[PDB]
Structure formats: C-alpha cells, structure tokens
Design a protein around this ligand. Structure first.
Ligand SMILES: Cn1cnnc1SCC(=O)c1ccccc1
Lengths: 237, 300
C-alpha cells in the first residue's frame, strides 16, 4: 500500500526499491507571442529514479524533441516516464530489478502499472510523504547535464557522494531530503549556505561539497534554520 | 402461451416472474403461473417471508421443455424440475387451470418492457455462464460469485461471465500502452467482439443477463460485470454506429425498470458519470442520459 511516516524504515531494508519522480519530465517557459497570445516553449527535462538505500540515481534526460508533434503533453509525460522506467527495469539483470517502485505522484500509478504488466511481482506504490525531489534541478551538476543534452541520454550519479562510508542510508536519505527541501523553499539561501566557505570544494566525481562530519552538522543546522525561517517569512510567525 | 405449475406452496414466499411479483401465503392453494409469453427467456424467482436473505430463481425457456416448481423440505427451497412425460404434464396443467388455481402472467398489450430487457438474451448462452448441464434451466442466487471474483471459491456454483480487466495484458498491446489504456477500441472490437463474443448480439446478451441478475437477485458480481461491459464501450473512441444506438436503447430500458429505491446500491457513480459526461461516447447516449438526469440526478 501507500508509503508514509509509519513505514519509513522500510526504505532502508534489503529489498531493492526505487523512487520515481516525474515532476521535472515536462518543463516549459511561458511567453507572449508577437500577436500578444501566450505560448509555451519546452526545455529539456529528466526522470528522477533513485535507490534510497544505495544512493544510485538513474537520471533519464528527456530531450525536447520527444514532444515534437505531440498533443496533451502533460498526459504524455506520465506515460513517457512509465515507458522509460519500464525500459530501465528490463535493462537491469534480474537480481538488480526492484521489488517495489514508489511513485512520488499518484497520477503515475496507472501509467506505470500498465507499462509493468510483464512484471506482476513488482509492487507499484504511492506515498503520502511530500518528498522534495522536484528540487533535483537545483543541484548544479544535474541541471548542467540536463540542459546541455542534445539527444536522449541516461546519466548515473551517486546522490550521496561517499557519505555511506561514514553514515547509514537512513541518515544519508535524511540529509538528502533536508538539503533538497531547503533548496526548494529558498534556493538562493540554500546555495549560499552550501558554498559560502571557498575552502570546502566539490570533488569532480561528487555532487555536494566535501564537508567533514562536524561541518555537516553546522550545514544541516543552517538548513533547518532556513526552512523554519521561510516558514515564518511565508506565514508571518 | 405456456405454463409453469407448482406442486404446492408450503412456505410463505414472494414469487417473481420476470418484472412482476406476488405474495403467496403459507399453504395457500397456489398451483402456478399461466399465459407465459412464448419467444422470450423468463426468470421465476423467490424470496421467503421468513428469510429475505438469499433471493434465488431459475432462468428458463418454455420452448425447451415442460418445467414445474416443487418445494423441497430438506434443502428448504422451491426447485425447478423438468417433466419428461408430456401427457402427465398436460393433464396436470389442464386440471389446475380448470380449478383456476394459477396466476396469469400479467402482460399489458402495449408493453414491450420484457422484450426490451431480454432482446439479446438466449438460453444457450445463459447455460454457458451458469454451468449445470443436466438441466435445461439455470439456477442463480444472491450469493453466487463470478469467476473473476474467485480470481481475486466453489467453481461449480460460479457465474462464468467473460472476464474484462482494463489493466491486463489481454487489454493492452505491447507498445500501445498509453493508446490502448486511454482508448479501449482495440480491446472492444478485436479482443472481445471479433475474438471472444463473435458479434455484438452476444456481447449485449451477456450485458443484459448481468443486469437482470444484479436487479432480481442483488448479485454483486453481476452488477460489476454489467458496469464493466458498459464502460468498455463508452471508453472506446471507435464503436460501430449501430452498437451505440442499440446500447442507448438497452440502458434506457434498464434504467427505466430499476426500482427507484435500489439505485443507491445498483448504480456505480464513477462509471455513469464517466460514461455520460467524460467518455468518448458522452454525446452518444441521448435516451439514457435523459432518463438518468430526470430519475437519478443525485447520482450525477
Ligand atoms: C558505479 N557508477 C557508475 N556510474 N556512476 C557510478 S558511481 C555510483 C554508482 O555506483 C551507481 C551505479 C549505478 C547507478 C547509479 C550509481
């Protein structure tokens, strides 16, 4: 059934599972036409498919050419997402295929279920969590590879960098969601926190800066402050 | 005109014959139903006064044999049986008519209701849904489950309706996932009509039979089947024009006949609102939409 606060530790057991987030698949800019009508221009997008235990992120880049000549793009985007996830599963060795796929939006349930009819033993689940994976495109290296793509492409990133060397996957996921929640609520402030000190760099093969254990505690505290703040600045409290 | 005689009526019971019904008191001198129109299937059904639980009954066609009813005190129900001795049967019926111990099938001359509800229903197809090959008639009751219900338990007592499942490999062509899920024409026309039912008359017959079992017995799996068969047509962009016109007539007479007080349980809000207002066929069911809006505007 649905994934919520009650069954949160299930994410970090040893049954392979993937989160799928489709919030960045179909992306547009809205603009005026010479005649003063409104029109959209699509920009490149991405499927965010993440193993929360290992950090393995399968970033399928959605090139704008996939929308050419197509109608009802927001509806198509859900089916294209389900087609690509199904293709990813079929491409993995049997022992790497997930036992569950958790979609972050309920509108993905029927498209993915239909595309995965061949896999009756893979459970397709919703979640009640309000996960901040839409903020993936606030991660500079992920945004860069999506915007530079000139054709459909799958790119692999470990979204935890090397954190699992020092912390558990429960703790790594909690850090990831905190960082992403911060970037979603106030991207400029969040990015200031992360890069303020020029002596802490991002390794070439990493997404996030090389913080010590102590510096991560400082960082995590600054992100919590931000989220509470914006929550005041928003609601006036 | 044909007759279904009763040996006796030892327990107080409400008896239905098609869309009609009458009460019989315990040990009342009742010996059956006469003047039953030839040319149609019929259903004779029962609800005991002491246990309104289990409505049950028998689908039959008088052209296929001489049938009568006899209460069984061991199994506690009214049973249909066939009499093979034609002369014994005629002599029994003539005696009961002479003594005027039979109710008359009370059809108004103007009235095409039963025809309109059973237009495509055939006994031979009923007997494939309800499997009991030693009898020419078919028993159905409130509790019988469908094959599809059993997949999600006694198979001999099941309703073997055609399984319809919109998220099944049968319904979805590899590579047409979105196309086939959002427009079920492939599933309707190739898989079900051309492949399984062979023609639309058999499809409509099963749809009509499912509705009648839902209405007369409160059979829940039959109601599921009726709505699934409606939804499969309404969710198809490409349907022959003659089928849409006929479906509109079929549903009109079903909605017209439904007891006003049973609409809450026998009509599925989602299917009907989808079919009349969202589906490809939202503009194709004029008679059905008009009676639904005037008789059950709450549902919508
Ligand atoms: C091994 N590899 C290959 N590409 N990046 C990496 S680093 C993280 C990792 O192992 C991984 C594997 C599969 C998918 C995502 C991530």
């Amino acid at each position: 059934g649905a994934m919520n606060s009650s069954n949160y530790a299930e994410l970090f057991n040893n049954d392979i599972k993937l989160f799928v987030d489709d919030t960045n698949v179909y992306r547009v800019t809205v603009h005026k036409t010479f005649e003063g009508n409104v029109a959209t221009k699509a920009i490149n997008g991405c499927i965010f498919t993440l193993n929360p235990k290992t950090g393995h992120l399968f970033l399928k880049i959605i090139h704008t050419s996939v929308w050419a000549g197509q109608k009802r793009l927001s509806q198509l985007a859900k089916w294209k997402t389900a087609e690509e996830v199904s293709a990813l599963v079929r491409s993995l060795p049997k022992e790497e295929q997930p036992k569950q796929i958790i979609v972050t939006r309920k509108a993905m349930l029927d498209p993915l279920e239909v595309h995965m009819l061949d896999f009756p033993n893979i459970a397709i689940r919703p979640t009640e969590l309000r996960l901040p994976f839409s903020a993936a495109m606030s991660i500079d290296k992920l945004s860069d590879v999506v915007m530079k793509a000139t054709e459909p492409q799958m790119v692999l990133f470990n979204i935890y960098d090397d954190w699992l060397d020092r912390i558990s996957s429960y703790t790594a996921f909690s850090r990831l969601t905190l960082l992403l929640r911060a970037l979603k609520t106030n991207e400029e402030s969040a990015k200031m926190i992360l890069l303020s000190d020029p002596t802490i760099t991002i390794k070439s093969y990493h997404l996030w800066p090389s913080f010590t254990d102590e510096q991560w505690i400082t960082i995590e505290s600054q992100m919590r402050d931000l989220i509470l703040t914006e929550y005041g600045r928003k609601y006036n409290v | 005109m044909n007759t279904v005689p009763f040996t006796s009526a030892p327990i107080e019971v409400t008896i239905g014959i098609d869309q009609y019904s009458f009460n019989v008191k315990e040990n009342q001198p009742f010996h059956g139903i006469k003047d039953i129109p030839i040319g149609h299937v019929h259903v004779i059904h029962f609800q005991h006064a002491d246990n309104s639980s289990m409505r049950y009954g028998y689908w039959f066609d008088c052209r296929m044999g001489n049938f009568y009813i006899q209460y069984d005190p061991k199994d506690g129900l009214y049973k249909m049986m066939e009499e093979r001795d034609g002369a014994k049967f005629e002599n029994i019926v003539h005696n009961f008519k002479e003594r005027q111990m039979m109710v008359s099938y009370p059809k108004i001359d103007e009235d095409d209701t039963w025809y309109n509800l059973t237009e495509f229903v055939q006994m031979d197809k009923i007997r494939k849904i309800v499997r009991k090959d030693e009898n020419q008639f078919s028993y159905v009751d409130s509790s019988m489950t469908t094959v599809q219900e059993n997949e999600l338990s006694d198979p001999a007592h099941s309703l073997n309706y055609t399984v319809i499942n919109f998220k099944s490999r049968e319904a979805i062509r590899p590579g047409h996932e979105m196309e086939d899920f959002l427009d079920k024409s492939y599933y309707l026309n190739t898989v079900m009509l051309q492949g399984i039912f062979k023609n639309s008359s058999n499809y409509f017959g099963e749809l009509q039979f499912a509705f009648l079992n839902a209405m007369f017995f409160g059979n829940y799996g039959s109601s599921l089947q009726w709505h699934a068969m409606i939804e499969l047509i309404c969710s198809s962009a490409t349907v022959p024009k003659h089928m849409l016109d006929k479906l509109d007539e079929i549903l009109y007479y079903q909605i017209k006949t439904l007891p006003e007080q049973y609409s809450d349980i026998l009509l599925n809000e989602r299917v009907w609102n989808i079919c009349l207002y969202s589906s490809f066929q939202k503009n194709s069911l004029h008679n059905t939409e008009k009676i639904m809006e005037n008789k059950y505007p709450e549902l919508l």
